[PDB]
Amino acid sequence: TLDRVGVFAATHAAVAASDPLQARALVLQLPGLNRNKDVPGIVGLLREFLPVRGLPSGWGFVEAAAAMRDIGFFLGSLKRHGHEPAEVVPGLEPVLLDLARATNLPPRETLLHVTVWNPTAADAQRSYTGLPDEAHLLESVRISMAALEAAIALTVELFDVSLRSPEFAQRSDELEAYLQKMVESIVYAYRFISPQVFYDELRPFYEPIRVGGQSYLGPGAVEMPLFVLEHVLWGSQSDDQTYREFKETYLPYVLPAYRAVYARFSGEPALIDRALDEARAVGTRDEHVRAGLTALERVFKVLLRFRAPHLKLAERAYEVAPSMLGELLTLTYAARSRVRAALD
């Protein structure tokens, strides 16, 4: 039914199935060490598989990203106990920079490494804490990530589709159905994840680390390239500084394609800006214009069905949240309102 998801999931699975450092049984031991707060043990465990003499030259993106995933869980772990991994692990930083080069991504772990590039089986899944809530946390992202990537593709395609065309409404309705997975993610999180366990036990593992003379943020669903999708959809031309800064902050953490998608659309008006300009020039008595705008409004409706419940979720945990959440929600409502005013 959401048939575009399959190829994305299949590329994720290629990385999930890769164990080039033969680290599976070793990374499974990390949660026990984190529970004991055993920093020397954690370093000693990494040094058991960490390449000291470089990366095998037969490797490609898949193996390098898999290697970054396995070393990566030790990065957030060591920082969680108060230590810069690059300061406490000999030869680690060069390795991290080599993997950042091989994958064209930061020299640490990201959301991608800890979720969709991370195998799902109990005898294989990598984790910081080994907690049920962490298992649930990773799954919440696996629900929607492949659908999100498909949604980005659909958004780029929709950009060049004229509102006068019946394709616009059809494409808009299809983009909605993919973004509905974002809502499924939140419903799943609110049902299965303890806010208190997240804040007290999970969140301490996602702090920044210093590599190469700069700071790199830890894994978060904030790194999901939804912001790129909405760059193209509504936000590219926005003059909100805080929002611009927010997008530029997480940009390095997404796949290179989406960094390129983002670059391509910064110089153009957003989809919403073109669609509304077209609607005012043609008229709303054109049925394809009416259906186009109606379906586009439902796209904004589903984004809000993710974003509003997600704010409550974050505030519930931080009751045990960064204000940008509220600001982004307000912006999205304004965009939806513009689409509504196009029909009222």
Ligand X SMILES: N[C@@H](Cc1c[nH]c2c(Cl)cccc12)C(=O)O
Which residues bind to ligand X, rule: CB under 6 A?
111, 114, 137, 140-141, 206, 219-222
Q: Which residues contact 160 (CB under 8 A, 6 or more apart)?
A: none
* 151's tokens: 């949604």
Give the nearest distance from C-beta 194 to ligand HEM in angstroms.
Answer: 8
- Nearer to ligand HEM by Cβ, of 106 and 292: the residue is 106
Give the nearest distance from C-beta 100 to ligand X in angstroms.
Answer: 19
Nearest to 264 by CA among 228, 227, 223, 299: 228
Q: Binder to ligand HEM among 102, 224, 270, 299 (CB under 6 A)?
A: 224
Q: Is residue 229 close enough to count as binding ligand HEM by CB under 6 A?
A: no
Q: Binder to ligand HEM among 189, 229, 272, 296 (CB under 6 A)?
A: 189
Beta strand extents in the chain (DSSP E only) = 209-211, 214-216
CB of 128 within 8 A of CB of 34?
Answer: yes
- Nearer to ligand X by Cβ, of 71 and 137: the residue is 137
- Nearer to ligand HEM by Cβ, of 88 and 314: the residue is 314
**Residue 136 annotated as binding?**
no
- Nearer to ligand HEM by Cβ, of 86 and 224: the residue is 224
∠ CA 19-112-319, rounded to 5°: 125
Range 80-83, long-range pairs (CB < 8 A, 24+ positions): 80/34, 80/128, 80/204, 80/205, 80/207, 81/34, 81/37, 81/39, 81/42, 83/39
Q: Is residue 235 close enough to count as binding ligand HEM by CB under 6 A?
A: no
What distance lies between CA 154 and its chain's CA centroid?
17
**Residue 222 annotated as binding?**
yes
- Nearer to ligand X by Cβ, of 129 and 172: the residue is 129
* 206's tokens: 């996602």
Return the CA Rg of the chain: 21
Size of the site for ligand HEM (CB under 6 A): 23
Give the nearest distance from C-beta 328 to ligand X in angstroms.
Answer: 13
Task: Please identify, among the stretches 72-80, 150-158, 254-262, 322-330, the one whose residues bind ligand HEM according to the rule CB under 6 A.
Answer: 322-330
Nearest to 42 by CA among 97, 95, 89, 107: 89
Which string of x and - marks every residue 136-175 that binds ligand HEM (by CB under 6 A)?
Answer: ----xx--x-------------------------------
Binding site for ligand HEM (CB under 6 A): 140-141, 144, 185-186, 189, 193, 195, 198, 220-222, 224, 226, 307, 310, 313-314, 317, 321-322, 325, 328
